[PDB]
């Protein structure tokens, strides 16, 4: 009642964007990404590091918002965290 009222759901374009920002993120930060996904989605606890799937359709706006918040804080600041 509070969460979704503050954090509106990501549209398809947004979800594509988030798919693109996550893909621009390096291994280091991917650890935080998968941490946010896994910790918000306990059903996805079996996210094998060799084969991590991102299914935004099960991801709550909560996760989608925290993810976007993080990916942007990384890429908008450092478009290339690696050299």
């Amino acid at each position: 009642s509070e969460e979704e009222d503050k954090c509106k759901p990501m549209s398809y374009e947004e979800k594509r964007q988030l798919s693109l920002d996550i893909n621009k993120l390096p291994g280091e930060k991917l650890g935080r990404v998968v941490h946010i996904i896994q910790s918000r989605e306990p059903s996805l606890k079996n996210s094998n590091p060799d084969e991590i799937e991102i299914d935004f359709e099960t991801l709550k706006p909560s996760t989608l918002r925290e993810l976007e918040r993080y990916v942007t804080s990384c890429l908008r600041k450092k478009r290339k965290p690696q050299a």
Binding site: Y12, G27, L30, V34, K45, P49, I52, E53, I54
Partner: peptide, 19 residues
């Protein structure tokens, strides 16, 4: 139904390895 951007990525360092 709708073909959505389902992502797959490999993450270095298996910190989350179940036992």
């Amino acid at each position: 139904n709708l073909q959505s951007s389902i992502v797959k990525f490999k993450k270095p360092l298996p910190l989350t390895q179940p036992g």
